[PDB]
Amino acid sequence: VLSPADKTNVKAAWGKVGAHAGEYGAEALERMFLSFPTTKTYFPHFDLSHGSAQVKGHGKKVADALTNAVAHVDDMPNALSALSDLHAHKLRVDPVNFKLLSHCLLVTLAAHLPAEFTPAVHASLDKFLASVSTVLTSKYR
Amino acid sequence: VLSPADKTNVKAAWGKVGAHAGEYGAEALERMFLSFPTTKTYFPHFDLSHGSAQVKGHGKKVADALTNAVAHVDDMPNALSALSDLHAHKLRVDPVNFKLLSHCLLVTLAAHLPAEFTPAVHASLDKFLASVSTVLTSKYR
Amino acid sequence: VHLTPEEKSAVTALWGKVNVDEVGGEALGRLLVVYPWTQRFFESFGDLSTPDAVMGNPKVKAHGKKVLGAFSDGLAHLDNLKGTFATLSELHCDKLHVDPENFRLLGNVLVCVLAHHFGKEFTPPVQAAYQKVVAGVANALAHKYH
Amino acid sequence: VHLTPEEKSAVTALWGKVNVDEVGGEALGRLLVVYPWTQRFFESFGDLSTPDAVMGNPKVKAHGKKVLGAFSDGLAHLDNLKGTFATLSELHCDKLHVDPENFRLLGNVLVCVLAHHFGKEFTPPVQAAYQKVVAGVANALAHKYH
Ligand code: HEM
Ligand code: HEM
Ligand code: HEM
Ligand code: HEM
Ligand SMILES: *Cc1ccc(CON(O)O)o1
Ligand SMILES: *Cc1ccc(CON(O)O)o1
C-alpha cells in the first residue's frame, strides 16, 4: 500500500517530470528493449529503432497514464480502469514484464532527476510503479 | 480478486483435504526444499531431511494458516495480519519465495486430489495462493 | 545447472509411462485455462471461451501433442538442451514472437499435470528432477532470443 | 550469452570513474532502504531506524565497501565469473544463508545508483551492458548453492 509519505514523494518527484513525460517514457521503453530484449516480443509491429515516432508516441501514452495515476493516487483502480481492461483482455502482456518496465522507469528518473532521487523517494517510486503494475494486471484472470 | 466460483472451488478442494492438511503442508515444504534449494537459506536451524519433525511441525502451522484463510476468504488480510507482520518484520523472507511454495502447494494438492484437481479448480487454487502470498507480503515496505 | 545421474534416471523412468499426446493436450489446455492471457498466441484455434471448451478443443490437443513431442525428443539430449532447441528458439523469437516467460509457465503446468496424473509416484525427488528439466528446456528455448 | 567487446569496453570505461567505497555504501544503504527485508542480515549493525540512519550508518557503509570491492575486482574476470565467485558462492550459501535474490536486488539498486551518479552518461546501451554484468555476478554468486 502507498503510505501518505509515499504519495507526497511520488507527486513531488513526478511533478518534476512535467513536460518531459513523453521523453522519459520513450527513454524508459528504449532502456527496456535494450536491457530486456524479450520485451520486444510484444512490439513486433513497431519500428523499435532509436527515435522512432512509434516509441515516442507510446512513451507519451505510458507517461500520461502515470500522470493520471499520480493525480489519482487515492483511487488508481478506477482511474486506470480502461487501461487494466485493455492489458487484461487484449494486449495480454505477461505480468513479469511490468517489473522490467518499472525498473527502467526508475533508472530513467534516476538519470534525469539527480536532486529528487533520494533513497526515500527511490523506495516510494518503486512502490508506486509496483502498485500501478498491480492495478494493470488485476483483471488478468 | 477471487470470484465466487474461485471461493467455491477453494472451499471444495480444501474441504476434501480435510484432516490431511498438515501432512500436505509438510510435503509441500519438502517439495520446495528439493526443487528450489535457495529456499533452504531461511531454515539453517532446521534438519531438512525427509521426515523431519521440524518440517512436519512447520507444515502443520502453514496448513492451519491456509485453513484459516479459507475460513475467512472474504476477510483474509485481517485473518493473516499477524503472519503478515511476522514475515515482513522478523522472518523477512524475500517475496519471490512465496511463488515457489505456492507452486509446491499446488503440486502437492494435485498429487492428492485426482478427482477434484480439475483445470478450473487448479486455476482457482493458483489465484488463491497468489492472493495469500500477496497478503503475506503486503507489509514488507 | 546440470542433472545428476539419479535425476536423469528418475526423469527417464517417469517418461516411459507418459502418453505424450494426452499429457501434451492436457498441459497446453491447462496453460490456457490457468493463465488465460496465454491465449493471445492461439487466436485462430477456435473456441477457448470456457475451461471445458479449451480442454476439448481439437486444435489445442493437436498443438499440445506437437509441443510435448518436441519436449519429449529433447529428453534424449539432456546434456545439450541449448543445441537441441536452438532452431525452435529462433523460431519462437523471430517468427512467433512468444515471450519466453510462457515456457516457464508451461513448465510449471506440466509439473502439475504429472503430479495430478501420477499421484504418489510423483515424489518430491522426482519433481525436483523435472523442475530442473523444465527450467533447462525453458532456458534453451529462450537462449536465441535477441 | 555474454558481453560484446564494445560492451566490455563500456563497462570498464565507466567503472574507471567509480569511487567504489562511496558507490558501495550508497548501493548497500539503498538496498536496505528500498528493500528493507534485506536488513535481516544486519541486526548487529546498529541504527537502521530511518533512511538517513541506514545511509549514515558506518557499519552499513563498511559492508558496502567490502561487497562492492569484491564486485569491482570481479570485473577483471568477466569471462570467468562463476570461477571467480565460486568460493564466495559456497560461503554465502553454507555459512551466511543469503538468499540469492538479494544479489539480484543489489544489482538492480546498483544500476539505479550508477544512473543517479552518472546521469546522461549512463545511456541505454551502457545500462544494457551493466544489466548483463549484474545478472552474471548474481548468477555466479548463486551457482554453488545446494
Ligand atoms: C507502468 C506500466 C504500463 C503502463 C502505465 C502502460 C500504459 C499503456 C497505455 C496508456 C497504452 C496505450 C492505450 C491506448 O492507446 O488506448 C498501452 C499500450 C500497450 N502496452 Fe502497456 N503499459 C504498461 C506496461 C506495459 C508493458 C510492461 C508492456 C510489454 C512489455 C506493455 C505493452 C503494451 C503494448 C504492446 C501496447 C500497445 C501499443 C500500440 O500498439 O500502440 N505495456 N500501455
Ligand atoms: C502460503 C505461504 C506461507 C504461509 C501460510 C506461511 C505461514 C507460516 C506460519 C503459520 C508460520 C509459523 C508462525 C509461528 O510459529 O508463529 C511461519 C513461519 C515461518 N515461515 Fe512462513 N508461510 C508461508 C510462506 C513462507 C515461505 C515461502 C518461506 C521461505 C521460503 C517461509 C519461511 C518461514 C520461516 C523460516 C518460518 C519460521 C519457522 C520456524 O523457525 O519455526 N514461509 N510461516
Ligand atoms: C516446452 C516448450 C515448447 C516447445 C518444445 C514448443 C515447440 C513447438 C513446436 C515443435 C512448434 C511447431 C512449429 C513448426 O513445426 O514449425 C511450435 C509452434 C508454436 N508454439 Fe511452441 N513450444 C513450446 C512452448 C510454447 C508456449 C508456452 C507457447 C505459448 C503460450 C508456444 C507458442 C507456439 C505457437 C503460437 C506456435 C505456432 C502455432 C501455430 O501454427 O499456429 N509454444 N512450438
Ligand atoms: C555483488 C554482490 C556481493 C558480493 C560480491 C559480496 C561479497 C562479500 C564478501 C567479499 C564478503 C566477506 C567474506 C569474508 O569475510 O570471507 C561478504 C560477506 C557478507 N555478505 Fe556478501 N556480497 C554480495 C552481496 C551480498 C548481499 C546482497 C547480502 C545481503 C543482503 C550479503 C550478505 C553478506 C553478509 C551478511 C556477510 C557477512 C559480513 C560480516 O560478517 O561482517 N552479501 N560478501
Ligand atoms: C503497497 C504494497 C504492496 C506490497 C508492498 C511491499 O512491497 N513488497 O514487494 O511486498 O507494498
Ligand atoms: C485477485 C487477483 C489479483 C491479480 C489477479 C490476476 O492474476 N494475475 O496473475 O495478475 O487476480
Numbering used by the authors:
A (entry chain A), B (entry chain C): 1 to 141
C (entry chain D), D (entry chain B): 1 to 146
What do the authors report?
Subsequent crystallization of the deoxyHb-compound complex in test tubes using 3.2–3.6 M sulfate/phosphate precipitant pH 6.5, and ferrous citrate (50 μL) in a glovebox under nitrogen atmosphere led to formation of two different crystal forms. The crystals, corresponding to T-state and R2-state crystals were used for X-ray diffraction data collection at 100K using Rigaku MicroMax™ 007HF X-ray Generator, Eiger R 4M Detector and Oxford Cobra Cryo-system (The Woodlands, TX, USA). The T-state Hb or R2-state Hb structure showed two compounds bound at the α-cleft; the molecules forming Schiff base interactions with αVal1 amines of both α1- and α2-subunits in a symmetry-related fashion. There is also an inter-subunit water-mediated hydrogen-bond interaction between the ester oxygen atom and the guanidinium group of α1Arg141. The nitro group oxygen also makes direct inter-subunit hydrogen-bond interaction with the amide of α1Thr137 (3.4 Å). Expectedly, the T-state Hb structure lacks oxygen at the hemes, while the R2-state Hb structure shows bound oxygen atoms at all four hemes, presumably from residual or slow diffusion of oxygen into the crystallization tube, as previously reported. The T ↔ R allosteric transition is known to lead to significant rearrangement of the α1-subunit position relative to the α2-subunit, resulting in a much larger central water cavity in the T-state Hb compared to the R2-state Hb. The final Rfactor/Rfree of the T-state and R2-state structures are 15.1/19.1 and 18.6/22.8%, respectively.
